[PDB]
Design a protein around this ligand. Structure first.
Ligand SMILES: CCCCCCCCCCCCCCCCCC(=O)OC[C@H](COP(=O)([O-])OCC(O)COP(=O)([O-])OC[C@@H](COC(=O)CCCCCCCCCCCCCCCCC)OC(=O)CCCCCCCCCCCCCCCCC)OC(=O)CCCCCCCCCCCCCCCCC
Ligand SMILES: CCCCCCCCCCCCCCCCCC(=O)OC[C@H](COP(=O)([O-])OCC(O)COP(=O)([O-])OC[C@@H](COC(=O)CCCCCCCCCCCCCCCCC)OC(=O)CCCCCCCCCCCCCCCCC)OC(=O)CCCCCCCCCCCCCCCCC
Ligand SMILES: CCCCCCCCCCCCCCCCC[C@@H](O)O[C@H](CO[C@H](O)CCCCCCCCCCCCCCC)COP(=O)(O)OCC[N+](C)(C)C
Ligand SMILES: CCCCCCCC/C=C\CCCCCCCC(=O)OC[C@H](COP(=O)(O)OCCN)OC(=O)CCCCCCC/C=C\CCCCCCCC
Ligand SMILES: CCCCCCCC/C=C\CCCCCCCC(=O)OC[C@H](COP(=O)(O)OCCN)OC(=O)CCCCCCC/C=C\CCCCCCCC
Ligand code: HEC
Ligand code: HEC
Ligand code: HEC
Ligand code: HEC
Ligand SMILES: CO/C(=C/C(N)=O)[C@H](C)[C@H](/C=C/c1csc(-c2csc([C@@H](C)/C=C/C=C/C(C)C)n2)n1)OC
Lengths: 241, 75, 67, 61, 49, 378, 54, 54
């Protein structure tokens, strides 16, 4: 099969025509990457320092960084040692090369998760629809058992096994870890881990709109008054004889 | 390039101008502007609109013929 | 134990005018692929038609009482 | 508003290009303050508590 | 013959402070320049930001 | 006497931007010339500040671009200002060429032919531009376009390999494309000043197509302020596109690093190449495809030789007006089709529109002018 | 000018961009150089005006 | 290339691997100072001959 189906339009707290990200849910979604999608999915472009001021504080971020072994640069002896995580460290690489992703993750290659809500048509709605809209194979077509089944996936079949089932963690601050919650938060995190500037642009965009709303009528008024000498000019032709 | 005083010969045309400080920038902005804008639109609708309608209907049919083609109906 | 809002409001979605209609043509495709010998006139098509009508409704209400 | 506020603004500040400039630069500094945070306050209301600035006190030492 | 040339009536375009032929324009020159120069001063202030 | 008139630097500025005798009646359609100049400068200042943090190698090309957006202070704005300004530059180019056709401006031969060369150059620029991020669309778009040059009879393969620096769109090509994309906007600027030289030799055309020597007004303050207002609108259209929808015009494939093996399902140009992509894909033959793409733009160099009308402008020409908007709506068709795959409804109407573009310019509009002349008993 | 606290990563690439553009600005300034010059013509070894033998 | 990681190596790559790249590289390096000898001659001449009065 080749024929497709598109995501709907789930009403996110940030896809409003001017509205910022839900900062409480960027937090929850980090965890949904941290002990679930960190084991087959790279996030090479997001470091621990990025989480500061956004979801966690300075201490909390350092505390989360220290939780894993990072291969640090060569010592005096000449061999690479292993150290606890600092704030300036990148998110852990599960596979040394994308060829290891092939042999150790059921034939298929899992893509990089930073910039995911911007590299698939429909964005976060698509990822939410792929994550939440899991279902059993249709009649006539048999899924080859080294590949699963999703209606939102372009080829209908292929690759990924789904860990979006009820409660893969308990959320830090009083929150029920349901299917629709655990899918929402990752997406509300992956928006931020694709477009961090989100809030700032929208903040600036409001200022731009308010500036233009003041400036556009005022420049027009400057133009009109200058042009008025021409716009009210009267001609008369007085030929001789 | 050309400059004023060398452009062309013009005889017998008086022009009366007013200072911008003596006049209003928007004399009758809506009471004359709106009559004018419809008049301007009516002047051109039969000359600009007909190919765009023709495009629009080709666009809407073409896309409807695209999807309603690859799905079957018999075996 | 564990009350998922998706399947709680999905039951209101499956029970909609245009929704059941798309399951009717899915079922008539089901009881024809299963009924015949060895065809290839499969029902990946009608499956997606139902999920089109269903998930359109899902988005409208899902986010109302999510913490 | 006796001989008009615009008339006294012209005779006091707008006449000479020097005091006209000085009024703009003094005005540009005042306006920058009243607009930056004044528009930030409106950005606060559309995102009432969903910003990190509102969350703040939930995780404090 | 050049003595027939009267300037066309401008009432249609005239700012209200200077519509009266019996009224001195000097009375309202201050206020009138004020408005158009305030518009400009406010514009530059906006551009400056 | 006057310092602003006689100083061998201020004199040159005065006669181009201040005392210039301009027509009293030029439309908002005449604003795009200055708006192009703004666009060109805007691309230079965002371009340079981008070139400061960007690397030219396969290993770091994609990452440096990310580094800009994520790490570099306000780098994300500079990046999107560039990307959106690129196509904003194209909307102005399209308005500006369109206006030239409508109003008979093209009759200024030298200034018009220089403008065609400006177009080819700005498009040669942007095509080299989009390759630099080294996304999937960067690579495969680069691959699809270059491979066309293999069709040129005896000279075919040697040319494509020479532009490649090898046997594919490789390591050499990225860095090489960067160098050319740095220099070309400067050559553009130099060609744009000659464009303005040849123009000032006649002054502007106007909406009527009758000469305006009898009613000229000074470029300052009238067109200083009309261009000031017009630029404010450009910043609005460019900044709404940057601060609200930075990827609306952008293809999602370019957000995954280049893979020379895995080729994407759709090969989607940025909107400003879609009409031309359509014209090219419509013709089956290899040689003919490229020669039709080439012809699709070099055609504008023929339009003056195909002025048939006794009047200059389309302003008083009703049949020609209909034939013009047919060309715009037809170009709107080529656009939409270019952003579609080569399946059933799209092969036919895409091929059909292609014939129409050429029959409209090469035959139809030159006939309308002859008939329009005859109806006025001219 | 550093893009940091030493002559670092930022500085190399930044210096490259400036080294690409500056020869073009040079050329533009060199043509004005030639404009101002042609307004008098060249000087000569004697320092006396050469209008009588051009 | 403009990055620390590849800056030095790309320069070598030019000289060693790129066809006639070694000439282009040294033409540049020597032209740079050739440009300086001309600058020095030119300024010197300006002083000697009173050209600076322009
Ligand atoms: C809603 C928004 C409406 C937007 C429509 C704007 C069209 C211009 C229009 O205002 O003037 C025509 C018209 C006056 O017609 P007219 O009496 O024949 O004027 C003589 C000429 O048209 C002379 O007209 P003009 O010289 O005042 O206008 C000329 C032009 C156009 O002027 C601009 O459009 C005006 C700027 C908008 C400022 C408004 C502030 C909004 C906040 O200015 C520039 O040259 C712009 C060139 C830019 C090119 C675009 C490139 C972008 C990329 O005004 C209409 O009445 C306004 C529209 C009615 C709205 C009804 C709603 C009630 C409120
Ligand atoms: C692609 C992007 C398309 C968007 C337009 C971008 C702005 C184009 C700008 O460069 O030209 C400024 C240009 C003003 O330039 P101008 O120096 O006063 O010279 C007039 C034209 O160059 C020469 O044209 P004209 O003298 O033959 O007069 C055209 C006139 C243009 O008059 C006004 O500009 C229109 C102001 C009304 C605002 C309508 C907002 C649309 C909702 O009226 C229009 O045809 C349609 C007016 C729509 C009102 C009637 C519909 C009922 C509501 O305004 C635009 O052409 C108006 C666009 C109208 C599209 C509305 C279609 C509705 C059906
Ligand atoms: C090129 C790419 C950029 C695109 C930009 C497009 C956007 C449009 C913005 C362009 C700027 C246009 C400015 C708007 C035009 C208004 C005219 C303005 O320049 O005022 C003029 C005069 O200029 C001002 O008077 C100068 C005021 C100076 C104010 C300071 C500006 C901020 C700069 C800060 C200076 C410090 C230097 C920085 C040190 C680091 C003439 O005034 P006028 O309307 O005829 O009134 C006559 C004066 N009267 C009243 C005395 C009779
Ligand atoms: C050189 C030419 C540059 C001069 C630019 C002239 C200005 C053009 C006027 C157009 C109006 C623009 C809308 C106004 C929007 C703006 O006010 O919004 C503010 C907002 C910042 O808000 P905050 O993040 O809260 O600020 C934190 C610090 N206080 O800034 C906006 O994003 C910027 C607006 C972009 C306008 C684009 C202007 C186009 C010219 C670009 C060229 C840049 C040249 C600069 C290089 C100088 C070399 C050192
Ligand atoms: C190439 C990409 C193709 C994308 C197509 C863009 C989508 C179409 C948008 C078109 C907007 C048109 C605005 C409507 C204004 C217009 O129709 O009004 C008619 C009105 C009539 O006025 P007058 O004859 O002066 O008489 C006035 C007497 N009072 O105004 C003018 O004629 C309009 C001027 C035409 C300028 C061109 C604008 C069209 C834009 C499309 C670009 C043209 C394509 C150029 C070919 C490039 C090929 C390499
Ligand atoms: C934790 C909640 C996550 C999230 C958010 C995602 N995954 Fe995975 N994934 C895995 C494999 C092998 C694939 C490749 C399948 C194929 O061939 O396409 C994927 C695919 C993805 C995608 C891409 C689909 C698409 O949008 O087109 C996305 C967005 C995604 N995943 C997000 C493997 C794993 C895995 C180990 C078996 C685990 C754990 C996860 N995925 C968990 C997550
Ligand atoms: C062949 C199409 C063509 C293209 C492309 C073009 N020009 Fe022009 N340009 C012209 C013609 C013809 C005119 C004369 C218009 C007139 O006066 O009516 C002109 C006019 C102008 C004007 C004067 C203002 C005006 O609009 O009349 C400027 C400035 C301008 N061009 C600059 C540019 C810049 C910058 C570019 C982008 C590098 C460019 N042009 C692209 C042909 C074009
Ligand atoms: C301030 C020192 C100065 C420098 C540096 C300088 N110029 Fe000149 N240049 C002059 C002066 C003064 C003259 C007038 C000489 C005369 O006619 O005797 C001149 C003359 C010339 C001439 C005319 C031929 C001649 O030698 O008289 C050219 C061409 C030239 N300059 C170009 C350049 C170029 C290119 C550069 C490098 C970017 C440059 N100059 C650097 C000051 C200098
Ligand atoms: C100072 C050199 C420089 C100049 C001048 C320049 N650019 Fe670029 N441009 C860059 C670099 C570097 C990038 C790669 C970084 C990026 O993609 O943002 C780029 C990116 C691009 C892109 C890809 C946009 C994206 O992000 O998807 C386009 C398209 C483009 N430029 C077109 C243009 C056009 C058109 C001009 C004006 C004729 C121009 N640029 C001026 C250096 C330049
Ligand atoms: C690098 O690839 C792309 C860039 C983009 N900006 O869309 C697209 C993804 C791509 C390009 C499409 C395309 C269509 S059409 C065109 C093009 C490139 S170049 C050109 C000619 C007319 C210009 C020649 C200039 C020659 C001078 C050097 C003399 N036309 N490119 O899609 C396959």
């Amino acid at each position: 099969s080749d024929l497709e189906l598109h995501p709907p339009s789930y009403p996110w707290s940030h896809r409003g025509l001017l509205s910022s990200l839900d900062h409480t849910s960027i937090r929850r979604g980090f965890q949904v990457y941290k002990q679930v999608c960190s084991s087959c999915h790279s996030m090479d472009y997001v470091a621990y320092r990025h989480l500061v001021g956004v979801c966690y504080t300075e201490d909390e971020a350092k505390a989360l960084a220290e939780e894993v072994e990072v291969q640090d640069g060569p010592n005096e002896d000449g061999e690479m040692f292993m150290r606890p995580g600092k704030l300036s460290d990148y998110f852990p690489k599960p596979y040394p090369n994308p060829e290891a992703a092939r042999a150790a993750n059921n034939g298929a290659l899992p893509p990089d998760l930073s910039y995911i809500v911007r590299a698939r048509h429909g964005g976060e709605d698509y990822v939410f629809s792929l994550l939440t809209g899991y279902c059993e194979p249709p009649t006539g077509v048999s899924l080859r058992e080294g590949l699963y089944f999703n209606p939102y996936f372009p080829g209908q079949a292929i690759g990924m096994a789904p860990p979006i089932y009820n409660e893969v963690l308990e959320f830090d601050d009083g929150t029920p870890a349901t299917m629709s919650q655990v899918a929402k938060d990752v997406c509300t995190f992956l928006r931020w881990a694709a477009e961090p500037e989100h809030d700032h642009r929208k903040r600036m965009g409001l200022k731009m709109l308010l500036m233009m709303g003041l400036l556009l009528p005022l420049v027009y008024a400057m133009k009109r008054h200058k042009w008025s000498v021409l716009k009210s000019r009267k001609l008369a032709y007085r030929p001789p004889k | 390039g050309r400059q004023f005083g060398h452009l062309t010969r013009v005889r017998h045309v008086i022009t009366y101008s007013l200072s911008p400080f003596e006049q209003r920038a928007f004399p009758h902005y809506f009471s004359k502007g709106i009559p004018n804008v419809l008049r301007r639109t009516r002047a051109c609708i039969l000359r600009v609109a007909p190919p765009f309608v023709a495009f629009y209907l080709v666009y809407t049919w073409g896309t409807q013929e695209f999807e309603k083609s690859k799905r079957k109906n018999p075996a | 134990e564990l009350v998922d809002p998706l399947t709680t409001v999905r039951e209101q979605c499956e029970q909609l005018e245009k929704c059941v209609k798309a399951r009717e043509r899915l079922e008539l495709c089901d009881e024809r692929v299963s009924s015949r010998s060895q065809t290839e006139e499969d029902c990946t098509e009608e499956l997606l038609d139902f999920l089109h009508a269903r998930d359109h409704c899902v988005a409208h209400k899902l986010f109302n009482s999510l913490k | 508003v006796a001989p008009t506020l615009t008339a006294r603004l012209y005779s006091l500040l707008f006449r000479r290009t020097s005091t006209f400039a000085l009024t703009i630069v003094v005005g540009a500094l005042f306006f920058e303050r009243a607009f930056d945070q004044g528009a930030d306050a409106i950005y606060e209301h559309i995102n009432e508590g969903k910003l990190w600035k509102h969350i703040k006190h939930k995780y404090e030492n | 013959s050049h003595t027939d040339i009267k300037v066309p009536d401008f009432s249609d375009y005239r700012r209200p402070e200077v519509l009266d032929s019996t009224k001195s324009s000097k009375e309202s020159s201050e206020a009138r320049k004020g408005f158009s120069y305030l518009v400009t001063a406010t514009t530059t202030v906006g551009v400056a930001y | 006497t006057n310092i602003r008139k006689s100083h061998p630097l201020m004199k040159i500025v005065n006669n181009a931007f201040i005392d210039l005798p301009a027509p009293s009646n030029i439309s908002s359609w005449w604003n795009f010339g200055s708006l192009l100049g703004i666009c060109l400068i805007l691309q230079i200042l965002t371009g340079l500040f981008l070139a400061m943090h960007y690397t030219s190698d396969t290993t770091t090309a994609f990452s440096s671009v990310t580094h800009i957006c994520r790490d570099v202070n306000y780098g994300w704005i500079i990046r999107y200002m560039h990307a959106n300004g690129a196509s904003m530059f194209f909307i102005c180019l399209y308005m500006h060429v369109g206006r030239g056709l409508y109003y008979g401006s093209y009759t200024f031969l030298e200034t018009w032919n220089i403008g065609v060369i400006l177009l080819l150059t700005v498009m040669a620029t942007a095509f080299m531009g989009y390759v630099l991020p080294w996304g999937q669309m960067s690579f495969w778009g680069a691959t699809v376009i270059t491979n066309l040059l293999s069709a040129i009879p005896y000279i075919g393969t040697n040319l494509v390999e020479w532009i490649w620096g090898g046997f594919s769109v490789d390591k050499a090509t990225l860095t090489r494309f960067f160098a050319f994309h740095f220099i070309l906007p400067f050559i553009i600027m130099a060609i744009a000043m000659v464009h303005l030289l040849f123009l000032h030799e006649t002054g502007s055309n106007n909406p009527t197509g009758i000469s305006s020597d009898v009613d000229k007004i000074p470029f300052h303050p009238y067109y200083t302020i009309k261009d000031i207002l017009g630029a404010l609108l450009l910043i609005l259209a460019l900044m709404l596109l940057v601060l609200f929808a930075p990827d609306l015009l952008g293809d999602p494939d370019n957000y995954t690093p280049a893979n020379p093996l895995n080729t994407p399902p759709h090969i989607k140009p940025e909107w400003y190449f879609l009409f031309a992509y359509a014209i090219l894909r419509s013709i089956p033959n290899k040689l003919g495809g490229v020669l039709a793409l080439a012809f699709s733009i070099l055609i504008l160099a023929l339009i003056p030789l195909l002025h048939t009308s006794k009047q200059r402008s389309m302003m008083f020409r009703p049949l020609s007006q209909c034939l013009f908007w047919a060309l715009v709506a037809d170009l709107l068709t080529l656009t939409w089709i270019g952003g579609q795959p080569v399946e059933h409804p799209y092969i036919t109407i895409g091929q059909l529109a292609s014939v129409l573009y050429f029959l409209l310019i090469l035959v139809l509009m030159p006939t309308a002018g002859t008939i329009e002349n005859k109806l006025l008993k001219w």
